[PDB]
Amino acid sequence: MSHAPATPTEQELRAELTGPVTGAGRQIHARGVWLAVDDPAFHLPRQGWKIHLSARPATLQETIRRMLPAVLAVPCHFKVVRSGRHLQDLNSANNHPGSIGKAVTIYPSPEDVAPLARRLAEDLAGMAGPRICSDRRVRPDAPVYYRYGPFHPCYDINDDGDLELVVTDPQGNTHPGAADDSFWQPHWSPDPLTGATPHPAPSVLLGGRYRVVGCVYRAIDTTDIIKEARAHVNEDTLGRDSRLRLRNERYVLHLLRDLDDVPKVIDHFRHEDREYLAAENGLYVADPAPPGRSLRALATALLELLDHVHRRGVLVRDLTPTNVVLDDATGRPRLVDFEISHAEDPQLYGWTPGYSPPEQERDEPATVEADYYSLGATLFYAATGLPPTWMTGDPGNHDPRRAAEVLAGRGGMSGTILGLLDPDPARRRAAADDIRAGRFTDAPPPPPPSARQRARRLAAAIAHSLTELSRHAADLMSGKDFTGGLVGSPINLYRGAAGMGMELLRHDEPSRALARGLAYWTGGFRALRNGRPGLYTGDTGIAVFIAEAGATLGDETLLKIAEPLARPVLSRITATDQHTGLAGIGTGQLLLWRLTKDAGRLELADACARRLLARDLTAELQENPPDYADCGAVSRTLGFAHGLAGIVHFLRDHHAATGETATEAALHKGCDTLLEHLPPLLEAARAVSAKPMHASFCQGLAGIGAALARTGRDLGADDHLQAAREAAAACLELAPRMYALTQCCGLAGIGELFLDLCQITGDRTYAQWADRIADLILARAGGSPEAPVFPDTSLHGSSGGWSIGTSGVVSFLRRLGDPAAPRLWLDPPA
């Protein structure tokens, strides 16, 4: 009928290896998912040329059997994927695209690289496997590839503060390796086979088959969309390839005559190791995608059943806001994906929308009925402008928590989509949206908040968040996440220990002890290691965290560890930015100067300010981009990070500390320029086409307004405070469609602006606005009440970083319950 290829066990591979390996004196150690074999009398260098062997689970055992002679002849180290399942994951694109096909890795002596490769090309013959993109291939008939890279895990720091695997040139410079999933030729070592050292150069496309616009492309026939599949990638337990997925598609594309207006024409061809088959809705320039801006917007909803009635035994099983397109009005319905539109015994495994499918796309049988949870979920993203909330591991990944949007409005669908997103009963797709509203249509019935019990909720949140932080911190310091080609900074403010620690210092004695441990761990990690001087990415924020921990905890040794930490050579620094440049360094040095009272820190801030004042005319840029089109350089010009708002912020702090008149002149000039360019981006924010970027703290109105509020207070100007008020209003309107909950790009920065205005002005109105932001945050959270988990930038996982994770959220929530509590990193300490 339909069969299942061999999936080797770890035991069978161990068996295929044990005999010959013991023969040559080499030995097997299991580590990660790579049964490795070490050979004495072969010292592994640290970089060089390496051989990769591609394979499928089915072929893995034979790949091992036919390689051992060659690899055991020459002294070398090597490793083989743990078992067949680990290889199916490795050859799956969702996990790690650049690691597909690297079933075996062999590290030999340099002189022996070229022979082995060829010697392994022979004996491997026509055995097939996914083509390894990051590497070159010995011959197209064999699954042997090679590349230059690290053999040991040596990391260096990038200009973002993060850590990347590197090789080192003969001058010692670190070059980032194994990135961009493209072959990179070292200029100091020759291609051991071509004998040549190519050079990189820069020198939508003429596909030759059909000249037209990484396995997808857009097209128009060279005569009058070409989906691509790479061989042996995404192989099912039934040996079902991505090319076979295209074949299922071609089937339904020829079974398309009824409702054929919706999908496209077809054409099938193949080349080498790949095959090809022939209005971009989900982009919400229009916020509720208004059918006609009328009171009723069930038009799109009934249009869904328009294609539901197609029947034909075709179960899309994957109806996402990216799987919808509609030229003009509700007419001209279009759709362009059916890879998993099959209920026959060959039922392809989906769960493709991390969030939008039912709880029963666990390969459980398919049902148009089940396509309801994709319908309703689609409807959710239709109203909210944002996906429903799903998190890897959420015991309540499907629940009335979605009701916590309770916006409706455009069509007021409400309880209909609740049934349409209910559990298995399906409510019969809530009566098939009640036969296109013929039977019924529901009205929004939001519940009433429990008044002071809100506080209970809030309390619980912080409480649980604290415990969650304690987990993340342990995962950080134990090196759990210290794997891969890119490792997020384990110490910087943005995502590292310093960001978390600072917040945990302001909480209970256990959380303070966690911050103490984090301080000492950061100190250790930073010693005898490369770094960057920035505030949000680099040494300045780190030093601030350690010194403040030494202060509030009364730990002299912490202050001693921080004393020499952030004293850079400003002459080398060229950026003028809070995030990485001189402005952020100046502010952090002023914070350290207030805690330590070390004159050198004030001198550093003064030096920052002088170098900044030198480029005051260079702060005046004639080119302006009020539209987000191409580079939304609102962030690169006016945002708190990368922009003038943070520069102004630091100049204000410097004047407040010293009183130097030069800083005052430049401050007034920058403030005036910001106010000149404010009205346009305000209008852009108020438009319907606005994007959450316009309200973001890092890049948008929230940061600009925080800066201008502090300026209005300290300078006495009230035009600044009013600018901040208008900014805050725009942010309040854009808050319910924010993508993230974080400080940098999400709701936390909005609410922090509101709290700033309440503390400066005194208008408890902004406190109500902030309470609304916190309510949105608690609703958009996952997990359960008394145990809420907050999604980070991934939208499905949790993390502890301050600006992109849970600790910043905890900062906002904490500050909600303690007025007159300074804003971290923007206001001075108590």
In our burial notation (b when 16+ CB lie closer than 10 A, e otherwise), range 468-502 reads bbbebbeebbeeeeeebbebbbbbbbbbbbbbbbb
Beta carbons of 92 and 237 less than 8 angstroms apart: no
Q: What angle do CA 547, 551, 554 make, to 5 degrees?
A: 125
Query: How many beta carbons lie within 10 A of that of residue 146, not counting itself?
Result: 23
Q: How far is CA 76 from CA 79, 82, 192, 434, 696, in A?
A: 10, 19, 16, 68, 53
- CA dist 344 and 89 (Å) reads 25
- At residue 532, the 3 state secondary structure works out as coil
| Phi, psi of 149, rounded to the nearest 5 degrees | -175, -175
Q: Which two tokens stand for residue 596?
A: 């330590």
Q: Which two tokens stand for residue 342?
A: 């099959």
Q: Which two tokens stand for residue 55?
A: 């394979």
Beta carbons of 82 and 57 less than 8 angstroms apart: no
In our burial notation (b when 16+ CB lie closer than 10 A, e otherwise), range 171-182 reads eeebbbbbeebe
Q: Which amino acid is at 600?
A: G
> Does 345 show up as a binding residue in the annotation?
no
Q: Which amino acid is at 744?
A: C
> Does 236 show up as a binding residue in the annotation?
no
Query: How many beta carbons lie within 10 A of that of residue 676, not counting itself?
Result: 10
The H-assigned helical ranges of 506-643 are 509-526, 539-552, 556-562, 582-596, 599-614, 616-619, 634-637
The DSSP result for 469-531, as a single string, is HHHHHHHHHTTTT--SSEE--SSSTTTSHHHHHHHHHTS-HHHHHHHHHHHHHHHHHHTTS--
- Of 257, 363, 241, 378, the closest CA to residue 322 belongs to 378
> Does 606 show up as a binding residue in the annotation?
no
CA 806 to chain centroid: 15
Beta carbons of 8 and 60 less than 8 angstroms apart: yes
Residues at the binding site for Zn(2+) are 698, 744
Annotated binding site: 337, 698, 744
Annotated binding residues for Mg(2+), written as ranges, equal: 337
